[model samples]
Target: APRKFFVGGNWKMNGKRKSLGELIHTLDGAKLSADTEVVCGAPSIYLDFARQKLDAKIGVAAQNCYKVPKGAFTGEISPAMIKDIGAAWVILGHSERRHVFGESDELIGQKVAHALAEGLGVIACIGEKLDEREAGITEKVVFQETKAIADNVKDWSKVVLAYEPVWAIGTGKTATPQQAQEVHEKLRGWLKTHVSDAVAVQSRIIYGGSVTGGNCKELASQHDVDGFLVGGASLKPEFVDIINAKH
Candidate 1:
């Protein structure tokens, strides 16, 4: 089978109960692409609400999950809880979690291991900052981050690697199709070398930085950009259009 086009909306922390419910209604009302795999990363508080309201075909992803199944880790949710809520996916190693919440590459790596261990699919995020790009160490930095994720990945089938450059996320800086594909192709190459050829061939490497409706088609045209991990656009009506990027 071919790589399924995947689109994920990382709602982050910016949705109110009523507002998000309306967004859910929008998705439920739209004719999303049947050929594409659609998933939304809802706020931790609304996983159950979103999961229940969304079309079963449209998946819900918990934005952050803890490593251990159960613990006194305050302000954290476990992967099993996500499953209990009927959410089949989880978003880990997001740029916000890394830069804002102080989640290290290794820590995010461990989180991915446990999420999958608990039977949840993972949208594992990794990317370099603008400084890293300008310094011309983009590959050096992203390869290291991808390795952190690959280190804990026991099964590539349940994983969707999101290469969301920290610099482009929510910064109004979109990586041109060329820029996005180069990194994705490089990541794919890295996976082939460090992991296995089979794993690399099957893995889905997605771009998630300033991905908007106006630019989604062009970005999707990139062969290696299998999908997207959208930020701001996920909450709006255009998210439906993004889901249909391959359409």
Candidate 2:
């Protein structure tokens, strides 16, 4: 089957109980194109709320989850718990969790393993830090992050690779189409080598970081950039436009 254009709204550390109703209403009233697959990652507290309110065209995704099956980890959401809560998808290895909160790739691999074992889908985030990019080791860092998961997970059907460069996230800076394509191409090539060509060709590798409807069309045109994992723009009205970008 052809890869569908996937768009995920990462409502990171944003919104509240009162505001969520308006967001859902906006989406419910909008004309979401038939071709796109839309998903939103809300705060854990709001996942059930969003799931309940989100239009059938849109799906709910959890921002983070624990590596373990269950128990003992206070204040942590587990993969099994997220699955039970009707969240079929989870975003793991996000740059914020890795760079900001100190989550290691090994731990991320374990999380991927756990989520896949439970038959839940995953938006597996992988990217380089600003300093790493400045040092021209962008590919090296991205490769390490993704390869670790590929090593641990035996199946690729339930995962989508999200490439979010630290330098571009929330800096009002976006990667030029060529710049973004380069990384996407490199990632695709790595997948071909490290995994099966079937996985590499069929996999959806999406770009993240400062993505807006204004520039999304050009980025979406790239062969390797199958879709996007949007941040700030995702919270705005234009998020609907970004979701239908491929149209």
Candidate 3:
């Protein structure tokens, strides 16, 4: 069987109750591709509200989550809490979290392990920074970032690998289809050797970074580019076009 195409919308720190309802209604009414799995991530505060308003077929994800189920972590929300609110997915190790908030790969792996244990799906993000890419260490950086999770995660079915080049994200820049495919193919090969062949074939390795509707079709056409982890464009009506890109 073919790997299911997956598209995720990362709303980041945006969207309020009123605007999220409008967005939910739009997605609920759009003619999305039947084969595509759509997951939308809103701010943690609005996840329950978004889950309630959106179509059940469209899964809900939290932008981030803590490693533990419950604790006195203060402002942190855990994977168990996210699942308790009816969310089935969580996005971990995003560039912003690594670069802006300074989260390490080991910490991200801990989160992934805990999230999977808590029965929540995980969208694990890996990428190389501009300097890393420019230094010709893209592969090294990507491998370093993914190694911990690849070692810790036992269930590939509940995980998706999102490759978002740090330089391209939110910069109106994108890795060309060829460039993205090279990395995706390499990652799959790595999985086959280190993890398992089944996981290499079954896992959905999607791309992110400046993914707009205008360029999504070409990227989606790549043999290894399974789908997308959309950012800015996901907030617009054109997100429907991206959702239907495979069609």
Deviation in Å, model 3, residue 166 alpha carbon: 1.8
For model 3, residues 1-247, the per-residue Cα lDDT tens digits are: 4779888998888887778789889988896658789998888878888888887778999888789767887788887776877899999999889888899888899999998888889989998877778888988888877787787687878889999787665555556888888888887787678877787888889987777776788788788778788887898887787778763
Candidate 3 residue pairs in clash (backbone atoms < 3 Å): none
**Measured by TM-score, how close is model 1 to the native structure?**
0.95
Name the regions of candidate 1 deviating beyond 4 angstroms.
Answer: 170-174
- The TM-scores, one per candidate, come to 0.95, 0.95, 0.96
Which 10 consecutive residues of model 3 have the lowest summed lDDT?
Answer: 166-175
C-alpha-based local distance difference test score of model 2: 0.82
Q: Ten consecutive residues with minimal summed lDDT in candidate 1?
A: 166-175
lDDT of each: 0.83, 0.82, 0.83
Q: How much is the lDDT of residue 100 in candidate 3?
A: 86
**CA displacement after TM-score superposition, residue 201 of candidate 1 (Å):** 1.1
